[PDB]
Each structure stands twice: as C-alpha cells, then as structure tokens.
Amino acid sequence: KKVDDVTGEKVREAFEQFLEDFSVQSTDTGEVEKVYRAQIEFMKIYDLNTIYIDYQHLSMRENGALAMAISEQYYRFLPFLQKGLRRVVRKYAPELLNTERVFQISFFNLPTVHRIRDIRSEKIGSLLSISGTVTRTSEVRPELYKASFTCDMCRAIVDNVEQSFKYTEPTFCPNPSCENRAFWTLNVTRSRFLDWQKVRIQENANEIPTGSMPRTLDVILRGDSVERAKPGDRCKFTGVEIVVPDVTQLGLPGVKPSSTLDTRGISKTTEGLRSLGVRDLTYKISFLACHVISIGSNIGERDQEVFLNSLSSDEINELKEMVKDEHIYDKLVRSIAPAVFGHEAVKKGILLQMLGGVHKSTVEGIKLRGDINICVVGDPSTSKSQFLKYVVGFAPRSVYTSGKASSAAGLTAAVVRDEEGGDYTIEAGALMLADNGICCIDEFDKMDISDQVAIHEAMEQQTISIAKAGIHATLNARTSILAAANPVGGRYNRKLSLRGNLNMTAPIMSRFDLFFVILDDCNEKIDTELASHIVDLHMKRDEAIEPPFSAEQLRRYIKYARTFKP
Amino acid sequence: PLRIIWGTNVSIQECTTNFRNFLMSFKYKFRKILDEREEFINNTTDEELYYIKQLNEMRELGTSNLNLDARNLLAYKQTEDLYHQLLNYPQEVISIMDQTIKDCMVSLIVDNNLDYDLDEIETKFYKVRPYNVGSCKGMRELNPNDIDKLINLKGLVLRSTPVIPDMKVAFFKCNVCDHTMAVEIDRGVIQEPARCERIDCNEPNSMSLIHNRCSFADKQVIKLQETPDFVPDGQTPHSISLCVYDELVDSCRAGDRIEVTGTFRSIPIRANSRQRVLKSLYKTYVDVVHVKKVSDKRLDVDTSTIEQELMQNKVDHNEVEEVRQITDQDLAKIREVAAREDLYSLLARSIAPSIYELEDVKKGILLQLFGGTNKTFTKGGRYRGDINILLCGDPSTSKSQILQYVHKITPRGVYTSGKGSSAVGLTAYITRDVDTKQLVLESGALVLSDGGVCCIDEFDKMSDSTRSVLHEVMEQQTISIAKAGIITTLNARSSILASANPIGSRYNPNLPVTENIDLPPPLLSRFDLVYLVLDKVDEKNDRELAKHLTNLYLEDKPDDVLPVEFLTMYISYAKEHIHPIITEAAKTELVRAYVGMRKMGDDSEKRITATTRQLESMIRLAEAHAKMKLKNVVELEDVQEAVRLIRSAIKDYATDPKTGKIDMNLVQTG
Amino acid sequence: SFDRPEIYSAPVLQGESPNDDDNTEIIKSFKNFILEFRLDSQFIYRDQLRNNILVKNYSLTVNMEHLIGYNEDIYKKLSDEPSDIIPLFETAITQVAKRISILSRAQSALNSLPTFQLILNSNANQIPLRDLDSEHVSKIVRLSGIIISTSVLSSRATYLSIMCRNCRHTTSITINNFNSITGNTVSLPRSCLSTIESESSMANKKNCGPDPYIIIHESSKFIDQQFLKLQEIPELVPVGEMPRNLTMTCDRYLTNKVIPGTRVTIVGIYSIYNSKSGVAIRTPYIKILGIQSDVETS
Amino acid sequence: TELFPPNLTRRYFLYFKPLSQNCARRYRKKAISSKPLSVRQIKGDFLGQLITVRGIITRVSDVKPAVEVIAYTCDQCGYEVFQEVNSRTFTPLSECTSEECSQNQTKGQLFMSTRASKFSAFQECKIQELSQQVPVGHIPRSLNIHVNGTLVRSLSPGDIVDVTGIFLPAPYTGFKALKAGLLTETYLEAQFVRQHKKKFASFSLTSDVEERVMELITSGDVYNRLAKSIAPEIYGNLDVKKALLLLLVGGVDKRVGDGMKIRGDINVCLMGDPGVAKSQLLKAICKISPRGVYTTGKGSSGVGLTAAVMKDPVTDEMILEGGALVLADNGICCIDEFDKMDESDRTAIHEVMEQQTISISKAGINTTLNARTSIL
Ligand SMILES: Nc1ncnc2c1ncn2[C@@H]1O[C@H](COP(=O)(O)OP(=O)(O)OP(O)(O)=S)[C@@H](O)[C@H]1O
Ligand SMILES: Nc1ncnc2c1ncn2[C@@H]1O[C@H](COP(=O)(O)OP(=O)(O)OP(O)(O)=S)[C@@H](O)[C@H]1O
Ligand SMILES: Nc1ncnc2c1ncn2[C@@H]1O[C@H](COP(=O)(O)OP(=O)(O)OP(O)(O)=S)[C@@H](O)[C@H]1O
Ligand SMILES: [Mg+2]
Ligand SMILES: [Mg+2]
Ligand SMILES: [Mg+2]
Ligand SMILES: [Zn+2]
Ligand SMILES: [Zn+2]
Ligand SMILES: [Zn+2]
Ligand SMILES: [Zn+2]
C-alpha cells in the first residue's frame, strides 16, 4: 500500500478548512461574508478554471504556520492543496468537477517581492514573487499533462498518467497479458494537455547593479495565466522557483554532480559471454508562475465605456471636474514637464503627440497616419533631452533610445539564435516596445545612414518586414517618434535652412510634423529666472516642482481623452 | 604514536592543539615583531588578545565567519609549521580550523559562564577564511605540483554567470508505494537506489528522482582578468574562471579590483556531451575561499551606488566588507586635520608628490575625487554629483601621470586611450563563452567604470563617432542601449577625466582657445573643468622643476604631505558621511556669477560661451568643496572657490574677452 | 603508435570492515585451516601438500570432518553451495602451493603451477541412491554403489590461446570449472575483443564477424575428463524393477582411479543437465569430488 | 606483494643533452644529433631519433597539467588503483580493479584523487623554418614541439632556437576520407633548448663570462670599440652607432613610492635622405638585440601591432595574441619607414613610447597590456 505524508494531510485539512471558514467584514455594511465560498460560486457560473487566493488571508489564519508551511514547500504541498480544493468544490459546487477539469490555485500579494539576482538555490520549490521586464514571449503550446499509453505486447491502452516535468512512462502495466514494463507507445489523440507559454524576463533598469549586465530568466505560464504577459512592460510574477535540466554546464569549472546506479544488493555471476547507466545532474533555475500582474511600466480598451466602468465614483468625479474646467488646455500645457522652464510650444507639441490623432483607412486601401512625430533641434543645453526623459518616465508604452547606441535590429526587430540551435526567434525592437506609444531618440544626427533607412521604412509603412534566415514576418510599428537632434557643427547656424543644419535624410525630414528649433539667446532677466529655477530645483528636490495636475491624474485624463474620435 | 593523514604531513591532534594555542595566545605585537615594526608597537591595541576578542564579537554579532591572516600564523612560533600546512593542504587544515573554532566558541562560554545558550553554538557551522597567504605569483607561473594549494590573485572582474544550483542532497520517490528518501552526495557522485528501501515494496528500478524536492546549493563562476605584480617578457593578460560557493555568490560585481585567495584546482573536461570520454589535458580554475574588496592604497567604492547590494549582503550573511572600518582614533585624526587652516592646499599638495606644482590641476582632481552629493528624486529623477575634467595642453605637462594616479587611486575606474577604443567596446558587447559556448553580455569601459573615474588619455585622437557615445554618460550618467541583444538603460556614473592636445600638438597663442581645444560645443559644454595647461619658459620655474625631477634619481628608492592611506580614508569618510546642501546665500552667489558670465559672453565661435551646464558645474564644484571641509551646508565661500577654480582652469584672467587670444609673457605666471 | 596503458593497484588504507561471506575472507580462512590444522601432533595438510608438490601431484585430499573440527561456518557454506566455495578452497590451496614451490626448488638444489584440485572425502551418513530428492540438488551428497562402465578420457581445455581470423587479435582463456555436462558454460567469445578493449591508440566500420577466434592448439593446455555410471547394489533392489543408475563426471586426478565393477562410496555435487517427457524436466548427475574404494580387487 | 612502481616514486625528469659538434670533431665521430635540421629536412626516416631542429618559435601554448597516470581510491578495499594514460583523451574507471575487489563479489567504487595522481607541465610549441633555410619560392613550414616536465617556459615566441628532442609519431588528426593507411602525425618531444641570442634577464656572473668581460675592459676604450662594432660594414656614423649602443643598453627605470613610474628605455629616431644606410642599421640592431622586431610602416597594421583575440585549441580557450610591440617586449622594436604609418599605428606608438602599455577597449577585450619596447 502507498504511504502517506502526515504533514501533507494536515496541510490539506487546514487548507480545506480555510477555504470554507475564512470570512471578512464588509466595508459598506459590515456583513460577515466568506470570500472563497463566494469565489467558488463565481467560478461555477462562468465556468472558470482558476481561483485567486490572497496571501495575507492565508497568513492571518492560525499564528502564520499554514502560510509558512505552504510557502516554504509549495512544490511538495501543491497536490494536497489541489485535492483539498477538489473536496471543497465537491462539497459545495459539484457541477465544476464534471468538465475532470484542471484547477489552478493562484496566490498573489506576497509581503516581499524579490529581484532576479536575489534568486538563490535554497528557495527552489518554494513560493516566491519576482518582478521583471518581459522581453520575449512564446507561442501558446500544448503540454502533455495526462498521457495515454499503449503497451506494445498488450495492445491495450491505459489512461490518466501523471507527467512530472520531463517525459515519463509508467512501468506498472496493470494488464497482465505481458511481462515487460519499459516499452510503451504514446497517443496524442486522446491524451490530455495544458496551455504552456515561456516568456523571457529581464532585470529592471533600476535593479541592475553597478557594473553588471542584466540577466534573463525564462518564466513559464500555464493555464489561464497564459498571454497575460506582453513584450515591453514590467510584470510581477508570483509562482514557484523550479529547476530545469541544463546541458550547457558541461565545460564549466567545478565538480559537476552525477548519478551512478547503486549495485550492492544485486547478485552477479562471472559466466561471461559490464555496462551501467550513469547520467549527469546539471541544472538551471527557472520560474513557474501561477499569477501574473502587470505593474506600470511608468514610475507611478479603446472604447470609452469599458474605461469608465474601470474607474470608481471619486476618480470619475475628479475626471468630470477636470474636464469641466474652461482653462483645461492651459493646465495641460503647463503640467507637461514641470522641471523645464519655458518652451511652451514644445510642451504643446508633446501633449498633442501623447494625445495623437485618429487612424483613417481609405476605401482604395491606403492608411492615413494618425501618429504625430516631433523633432527638437537647437543649441546645446536647451533642455532637449529633458523632454524625452519626461516622456519616457511619464507616458506608458514608451522607450528611450540613444542614437549612437542603437542598431537597425535593435530599433525595429531582431532575429536571434539561441543555444547554437536550428531555431531562430524574433525579439521585438524599440519601435515595437513603443507600439501605440512614443519612441524617444536622442542624438538622431549621430545615427548612421543604415539605421535611418531602417527606421523611415517603419515610419512610412507603419510595419517592419523580416526576411532574415528562415523567418519571414510582418510586425506592427504604429509608433510616434520624439527625436532630439543637434545641428551640424554643434551650434545652430541661423544663416542656413533647416535642411542645411540637419544631416538626416529627406525621408526622415518629410515625416516629421513639427520641428521645434530652440535658440539660446543671452538676456539678463531670462537667464536670471532660469538660474533661479535651476538652483531652486537643486535646493528644493520635489518642493520646487508644483504642476497644476499630478502625473497620475494627467495620465488618467490622457487615457480618457484618447477614447474620443473627433 | 603519531597519526598522519595519508598523502599529507598533517596530524589532526597536533594541528588542533597548535591552532587552539594560537587562538588563545596571539597578540598583534608578535605580528609587528615579525614585520620588523618595533617602534610602531603600542600598549592598548597589541597587548590584548586578538582572536579571543574576535570570537567574542562574533558571538555578540551572531556571525559565523572568521577572517584569518596567515602571516599571523607565521608570527606565532608554535604554528610556524602550520602556516605551511595551511598553504600545502587547505582542505584538511581548514576543516581542522573550523572544528577548533567551534570548540573555542563552546569553551569561551562554558569557561566564563555566560548566559548564551550552547544549542545555538552547536547548531551553527563555523568556518574560517584564510587570506594573505603569500606573494601574488601569476597563474601562468604556477605548476601542476601547485594543485590543491592556497594562492592569491589580484584581478579585475569582467563578468559572472547567474546562480547555478549544484546538487547536494538527492530526493528519490517510489512510483508504486510513494516511499521517499534522501541521499547525500559523496565527492560529486550520487548513488541512486536500484531497489526500494522498504521491506513491503522491493520493486527494482522503482525509485525516481524528484528534481524540485531535493536540496541544492549556490555556485557561481566569475571571469577575473588577472593583473599580477610581475609580468614576464612578452606576456599578454588572460582571464581565469573562478568558482564561488554558498554565501560568496554575488559578492563580486563586474569591474571591481579584488584580491581572491583560494585553492588551486584542476578537473578533466568531457570531450563530448553524449560520451563519458574525458580529455587528458586538465582545466585549471580557482576554488575561492576568501575575497578582499578593500585596499588602503585606493579609495572605497561609492556607498550610494551599492545600497541594495549592501542590503542583499546583509540578508545573505556573506560578511564581506566593501568599505574599510573606521575606528575612533583615526576618525579623531580626521576631525583634527579637518580643522587645519591650509586643509585645501594640504590635500591638493598630497595628491601627487612626484608631480611638481600643478596646484590648480591637483585642486580640480581632488574636487572630482570628492564629487558633489547625489540627489535622487522621490518622483523618480536622479542628479549625480560626478565632476568631469578635461586637461588640454602642451606635451609633457605631467597630465598622463595625473591620469595614472587617478586610475590607481579610484576603486573601479578603467584607463583607456583614444583611437584604441571603440563605441561597442565602450558600451557593451556580446561574446562567446569558452566553457558554455553561449552568447553572453559583457560590459564596456564606461559600464565597468561606474561608481569610479573613467580616465581617457589622448582624447583628441578619438573619432567623432566614438566620442559621440560619451554624451549621455557626461549628461545623464546612463547608457541607453537598444541593440539586437541588449535593449535597456545601464547606470554609468563614471566621472570622465580626459587628456588632450591642441591641433598642432602645441598651444599656439595666435589661434583662439576654442580652435586650439578643437572640440564640438555639445561635447565641450559637458566638461565641468577645462584645464589649459601651458608650458611657459622661466628661469626659476624651470630651475625648480629640474631640481624636483632630478632629486628623484639621487637614491634608488624614492613641505608636508599626507600619506596615501590616510588621504584615501579621509576622502572615503567625507564621501560617505557628508551630504552638503545649498543655502540661499550660496544661491545668490551662484545666480550672480552665472548671470555675470552670461553677460560677459555677449562680446564678440572664437570664445567659450557660458552654458547652463557651467551653472550645474558650479553647483557640483561648490558641493564638493563643502564636502571636503566636512560641512553639511554649502556657503558663499565654497561657491566663490568653485567660480575661481572654473575661471583659473581656463585661464580666463589671461584671456582677452574680445579676440579670445592668450598672451604668454604678460599675464601668465609660471 | 603507442602501447597499452596499464592498470595496477597497491594497498594503502584499511578499507571497510571485512565480512565472513566475502570471498577473500573465505580464502583466508581456508588458508588458515590448511596451514594450522593438527590431527594429533603434526600438521597433516601442509605436509601432504608438500609431498604432493615433490611427487608433482597437483591436488589435496581433505577429510570433511576436519572442517567440523576447525570451522563449522565454512563447512556449512561448502555443503550448501559447493559450486561457489570449492573454487575458493582450490584458490587457497594453489596460493599456499605457490609459496611452497618457490621456496623448494631454490633450496633443495620457468615452472608454471596449475590450479590445484580439491579432492575431499568423508565418513558421514551415506545417502542411498533411491533417497536422492530435489533438496539434494546443487549440494554435496555421499552415495555408494557399483560401477557399470568408465568411459574413455575426453580432453577438456584448461588454458587455451585464441587468435582472431582476420583481426589477428591474440587472447587467452583460462578455465577452472570442468564439472558441467551437456552444455558449454565457457566458450569462445561471440565477437572480437579488440574493439572493446581499445588497447592501441591508433584503433585501425570494421567487423571481424561472428565467432572470429580460432584456437591455437600448440599453445593450449588440456586435461582429462571421465564419465562414470553408478548403480545401486543389486543385492538391495525390489524384485519387479530394473535397478536405477546415475551419470557422474570426474576430472584431473580423479580419472582412472576405479575400474568398472568395483564398489565405491562417492562424495559429489548432485547437479543438473538438460538433454534434448515433461515440460521442464532435467536429468540429474553427480560432479565427483572424491572416490573412496570400499574393497580393492586383486 | 603489490608495491608502488618506480614510475610512481620518481621525483626527477630525465633529458638527453645532444653531443656538441666540437667533441665529435675531436674524436672522428659523425653525429646526426649534433647537426641542426630545418623542419623541411625532418622526414619520416628521422622518427624515433634524437635530433636537433633549428628555427624560430612562433606560438607557445600555456602550461597545463597533462595527466600521465590517474590515481583512484576505493573505500571498499583501501587500495589505490593507478591507470596510465598515454593518449589525448581517456575514459575513467568506475569499478575497482584491485585484487581484493576482483576476488570479492561486491565491487567497490573508485573516486579520483587529483593530489595522488601524476601530472606533467605540458606545452605545445610551433617552430618555423628560418628564412635562410626555406628554398626558393617556398612557404616556411612548421613543426610541433611537445615540452614536458621542467623544460616548460623555456620557449617564447620569436626566439631563434635549436630544440633537440625525440621525433615521435602521433595519432592521425584530420578527415577520415582523406587518410590512406596508418598515417601518423609528428611531434618533437623536446629534451634540450639552445638559444642563439641569450636573454638579458638570464645573465649570470659565472666564472667563464668574468674573464671575457675583464679582457674587454682591459682592452681599453670599451665605449668607442663597442660603438664601432655594431655595424662594421657601415662607414662613419660614429655618433649614430654610439646612440644605438646606448639604445641597446638603456637607462634606469624609476619607480616612485606613490606608484607612478618613469621609463628607463631610450627611444631613437633616424631621419634622413635615402642612401644613408639607416635600414641596415635597424637590421643590425635587430640582430644584436635578443628581442628585436623589425617592422614596416605599412607592412604592420593596427591589429599586427597591438593584439588580437584568438582561440587556442590545445588549451581550448580564447587568449589574446599580441602584436609586434608585444613580441618585442623588454627589447628594441625597430620601425622602418616611420613617416608612412597610418594614424592608428601612430597612436599606438604615441602611447607606447611614454606609457609602456597599450590600452585596448574594443568589442573583444577591455584590457591593458605591458609593452616595454625601446623604439628605434
Ligand atoms: N529651460 C530649461 N529649464 C530647465 N532646465 C534646463 C533648461 N535648459 C537647460 N536646463 C538644464 O541644463 C542641462 C541641459 O541638459 P540637456 O537637456 O541634456 O541639454 P540638451 O538641450 O539636451 O542639449 P544637448 O543636445 O544634450 S548638448 C540639464 O541639467 C537641464 O536640467
Ligand atoms: N610639471 C611636471 N612635474 C612632474 N613631472 C613632470 C612635469 N612635466 C613633465 N614631467 C615628466 O615628464 C614626462 C613627460 O610625460 P607626460 O607629462 O606624462 O606626457 P604628457 O604630459 O601626457 O604630454 P603628452 O603625452 O605629450 S600629450 C613624464 O615622465 C613626467 O613625469
Ligand atoms: N655610410 C655607408 N656605409 C656603407 N654603406 C652605406 C652607407 N650609406 C649607404 N650605404 C649603402 O647604401 C644602400 C642604401 O640602403 P638603405 O639601408 O635602404 O638606405 P636607406 O637610408 O634605408 O634608404 P631609405 O630606405 O630610402 S630611408 C645600402 O646598400 C647601404 O649598405
Ligand atoms: Mg541632450
Ligand atoms: Mg600623455
Ligand atoms: Mg629604409
Ligand atoms: Zn503490457
Ligand atoms: Zn517502493
Ligand atoms: Zn578481430
Ligand atoms: Zn576496491
């Protein structure tokens, strides 16, 4: 008979008591309602597969022993939680279990969020919450969950075989027709699968240490959490730190562990006519996420109705009173980039670039561009880069790029080879991470000719075409461009035209809607006020910045206003 | 009789007794007698028991790591053999030392009858980290008889692999009866069970390994660029892969100069992945025991840069120090020297004693070493007090020696040359690893210089395209890369210290200052200080320079200047503990001076016009000057000194406002 | 053009604690029994082995009750599993005789010593031929009777040198078990052993073929083997039945010791061979370990 | 008994010094070991012989531990099992082959002991045919040298050398389809190394050098005599030869306690009209100096002067192979046609003549390498 884990049974009993006994006081009335019984009731009506469990709700039970036991040994205790949830659903809502369905337990809101570099080997198989910027995503693929196998000699099939990561075949063979166990055949027609996606995440820009490059991690989403991660945004993944076989550690220094078969209780004879099966144990750390939440790519859905149902009463009242103001345009203009003194025209252009125009498609088939492109040219130290830093730190889905550090494959899209294999993958470039956003490019003049050609192809066509290697594709690049460029010779020559001062090509010049030329003129009162503003900023930190609108309400107004089609 | 471990000359009983007597009977006066320092011996420091105090403070702090100096083992007479046994046989002797340390931890609390519980001492694993094991001979000068021996390597970290879980305990579960058991590793080999352990179930090949239930340990591989003290004829520097384990993982970042002591290993490498056939030529690496990140000859790393790294070090209990410990007496001496009336001239004079005069240049270098304070916004912005200096001038004005001194004195700077450096080599690149055959990201010179000073010699010889990279580093102290492999923004808070020559390789007074410097206004506006160093021929100046430069050759080994160790610790303390702020009186002087030079620039390019970046350079230089004198506020005197330094670096007093020319004989003073 | 890398060993540490069931400890206990046994006041077995070596008789005669006298554990191991313990005792005898023979020809003024033969006799209870059952299989039994016929001496191979047909790889096979009947427990290898050894650095797809080795007879060593037929005595046989008999195999110095018709008690292993009357039925036979003649004809 | 063999108890390495040509001339002996051969003249009939090859060393591998016999320990029996290795690759032992385990039913498991096994310091060197040994219109060939034991680090690139060793065959490395029979590769297991130009750092004040130095001193006027004998073919240019002799000698390098250094090497330029034999003087200085590299202003490019990253297959690692300035480290580097150089080479020399280092920050490596050339 099978032996049972007493700790696992206690964890299962505590979890099934927690699911049916936990309740909170209602905010509006004060009623004592059980949130997870209501969660199962909600899942029953809409035929959902996943249940979301808050971590502090689990932690406040007992003295915190159940939450610690689940968090430290999540891989071990996960099937016990699954069968406890199955028992609770069977007792309350038996109609869920018929469709046997796969239940996904999603934990969220952990007390501490760890970096990628704080991931250690002592937390393998434990509940964790990490964060990172998604750089690549994979196609949704089926993963063999409950395989079906036919024995070769039996020619009789067996069902419901659990698959634990690497591909396994049962050796039980309950049919007594044969006497062999190893030989089996897999039938994918009646086998059972799960959703599987592998998204690659990277360290956040502020989390990178002093001299090191960011290190990536392949985090895997299964079930309902698939396709909640998008390339180019910061996401918080809650899940379990798992371990994956790795072959690349063959040439690394150090004693690599190996697994030799133990031969002590095996009787042998020297009859004649000595080989053994030994395998290397080399591994790497991966993450298996159960809950994905996308935090803001900033520091802090086209229809208007679906956006307005998202906001509550106080926030929508703030939106209405902000719209109701007759001087709303001046407030919007003076609220853009409060650290920059003056340059009201550039702030107007940046605000209109954030708002943008509508996209119209002509009956014959051509598309009219609704994105507004801004180019800022002028003298050195005229706060041209401050605007671009403000835009990338404020506007969502915005990326900041240097002209010299960029590349043709880096700006649009790259075809990259992984692990010296036959498979090639597409990594999104700067114009794709800024899709329906603003791509900020300082030193556009320092960009060479080839990258300028590669970027005006995406400016004119609004698409990126890939024909490298065996990959052919057409990707979307609907992106407004905010460029900052210096004139030839550094200083802006007033005697020449705009085309004479700029070395960038004519297809670049023809697609910029607004050119803002900023000139440095030495006058007493302007220089005095600017110096007072700068030294006051340095003295007063954030107290010298007093915009009419905060960043969050400005973003809310921008999102509300982008729904309208004039 | 006497029992000896096979293959060694190490006896466990003799080594334990000798190390115990060393622990309970060592005084630092023995170390000073060994080092031939008799008049440096004092009363209250050396006469106390050193290691007994260290174990007492380890018990009080709850730590479990002892840093052992092997030269101290040489100092004690009974352990003079043990030192050799530590060098020859680290594996046995270090374990013997760990057992002796645990025994002494038990003894210190059972003998003195403390209230500390014995169970916490028993459950804790105490380990020792020996360092300073000998001279830093290069790894290419090592021999196959040096395998499994403690060695020192001073080097620069280039990159490091992510954390690798290596298996320690393996977890096996039966398929039919769910019987689970764990087996420990034995010298890298795990004996997987052929049959089930239970008497009820004995099915062969029924035990399967669960990769997630079993426990692992941390292992990291770090690529170190060795910089040995002695380099043979025609030898090119190489890189060593060195392995750190457990707590030492992620203790070393890319671009720092560290002193790694560890045992010298060699393992065979499989020729193919599918086969078990091993290569006869072994692969050598270093199994790291202890890492030293602090040097008295140079400054410490910036504490504002590694705050989250410091908190992670506190969490991981690695107990490696990134900054030097400051006692009470040397802090008192710091407070005493900060009260000197000639503190600015004393600190500037003590920078480069071998370099004669260049007082204003040394003052600027000193202010750049101090730097302005770093203000990060609560909203999300960041202002970095990094001072950038250009040294344009005549040949042989000892500017390249100034770059050498700054490169040696900084924690993690990188020295580079014009026309020998590229944009990709300055930002980041993708390389092929020799161990994994994988594409890895490696840092450029600007990223490796973050938190330090990037020294660029012969700045005029650099290409315009290569110099175009520097703009974002000078302005925002970041590098925003969008390439095929890297699309991110990397912090590069490196102060740029550049050296340059005029167009004709010598300053020509007929041509103006801007044409002589020959830099674009966007690049020249980002330099906080621009030092025009000139060669004016004089009688007394040439006589004094010749006497100073000839007095070095009087003997084989060459006013009052501070020692380099005290200067480094004073600058480090001032950078760490002083964050000056600007007052209204300083604000008035800043605005007045900025507006005054903006008005002066109206006269008729040929002349350096004033810039908003010059106002920011004024603020940074004033804040650095206030930080030097240990003041938490920036007063009017600091701003006046910053303006005076800015004017004197460009020789504005000698320059004519209209024509932009510089006259040598009239206004310049040598 | 390099040679074979060589593998050699040397004892350094104590290792794990020895076990009684270990083959080395059984051989050591057998050597101790041979060297240290005293019947009344003389070491009979070492003197017998010496006198056997001078007369060039490579065998030892050991009474089984002496094992009761010395060590019962090795006696029970030898009685339960004789096929696993008799080679160990022969190894002990030849290990003693190797150091006896070296000290002899260098003192009483090349030579190869074969594996010595264990001949062991006993005076214990005599199992009748009709009382042999299945629990005596692969065990030492003592049984008496009268001999019908002794076959001619067949030539078995002890040491044989072989060479590959085309590969020309030389190999040597030493055989120390000749007690099998109707079946080749030891035969020539099915494939060439040059490939698996990888003895040469060159290693010059090449296949030598199935069964490529041929026996080089002028460098091979052979011994003699005899088949005996033992019947129960005709005086004690039920009236209406033919008397039953058993086939026996003897080798080396046990051949040509008895003539047909003599009455002998024989110690031997009751064992099994398959002859090609029941789905799984095996013909029993006796591996003769010693022959004792009750009466000696004139 | 089973004892440790003598191979496992030897603390010494044995080498065969070739007999000199003079001693063979004294006693009417004709020795093939004494006569230096080029790499073209070493044919297949010289295999197995102790022969001397004359040539320039082009590439020297890093010293690595090449195992000859591996020691395994067994916990079951306590024996140490030693497995010899004489190939480029080996397979390890898994089950114990000692007599106690071989006789027993339960076999022990072997674990490697690196300290108890026997290693050799191993280097692979490439020796190239000299310019005067190559026939008309041919490319110089190369030969492999295996340096083992205490002879390691005695060969450095760019050294004119006589290497005496045993010409031995090796297993075939190459395409299987192109081999005909039992083809073997060749290498020269080095036994003795003779330097044509003795290094200045290896100088020792022995008894033999003392009498010759004293004779040269007491001959009188050592400075003028050494100056006139640099290039006796070139008439005149007494001051030029004097400063070239000072270039060869050089000044005293200075190290100051603050860490900065002042170079002791002199740099000399010879600018003049054609036909004044300055190229001949440069070639003469290259011949005199033990580490002399002669370069052309356009013949040597930027990558040929500073460094380049390359893969070493014997050690299987990427290493930085230096240029001409690296090859002439602690020696005189002679650059003919200095006015025809491009700006990158001018920049490299511009840094080298003062700093005595090259700082390379490219996509390959971010490093600083020592180049202490005295530049002519
Ligand atoms: N109008 C302004 N308002 C506020 N700060 C300003 C203004 N003009 C300049 N500054 C400051 O002066 C510096 C100018 O930096 P940048 O924005 O990089 O100049 P720039 O206009 O981008 O010219 P380049 O192309 O970088 S040379 C920053 O520290 C700004 O904060
Ligand atoms: N004022 C000085 N004080 C001390 N040493 C000096 C001084 N002026 C020149 N030297 C020395 O003269 C030599 C000239 O080398 P450097 O001054 O380092 O060259 P440089 O100043 O970088 O000018 P370059 O290289 O032609 S751009 C060095 O050994 C200096 O130490
Ligand atoms: N003073 C001299 N004594 C002896 N031979 C001389 C003298 N001057 C010139 N020659 C010879 O004239 C020839 C000139 O050859 P080079 O050494 O190439 O002269 P050069 O100065 O190098 O000319 P270049 O390469 O255009 S600078 C050689 O054969 C020299 O041997
Ligand atoms: Mg800018
Ligand atoms: Mg210089
Ligand atoms: Mg010439
Ligand atoms: Zn079956
Ligand atoms: Zn079981
Ligand atoms: Zn064959
Ligand atoms: Zn063994």
Numbering used by the authors:
A (entry chain F): 101 to 199, 260 to 433, 441 to 467, 498 to 763
B (entry chain D): 176 to 733, 739 to 784, 788 to 853
C (entry chain 5): 2 to 110, 129 to 223, 233 to 304, 319 to 340
D (entry chain G): 189 to 564
Question: What do the authors of the reporting publication say about this deposited model?
Answer:
The Dbf4-dependent kinase Cdc7 (DDK) regulates DNA replication initiation by phosphorylation of the MCM double hexamer (MCM-DH) to promote helicase activation. During this process, DDK and S-CDK, act in concert with various origin-firing factors to convert the DH into two active Cdc45-Mcm2-7-GINS (CMG) helicases which then serve as scaffolds for the assembly of bidirectional replisomes.
After multiple rounds of local 3D classification of this region, we finally obtained a density map for the DH with an obviously structured fragment nested on the NTD-A surface of Mcm4. The map was resolved at an overall resolution of 3.2 Å, enabling us to unambiguously assign residues 132–153 of the Mcm4-NSD to this density piece. The NSD fragment, largely in a loop conformation, wraps around the NTD-A of Mcm4 and extends to the subunit interface between Mcm4 and Mcm6. Its N-terminal residues before residue 131 appear highly disordered. The N-terminus of the structured NSD (residues 132-141) forms a U-turn loop at the juncture of the OB and NTD-A subdomains of Mcm4. In fact, two of these DDK sites, T140 and S141, are located right in the middle of the structured Mcm4-NSD (residues 132–153).
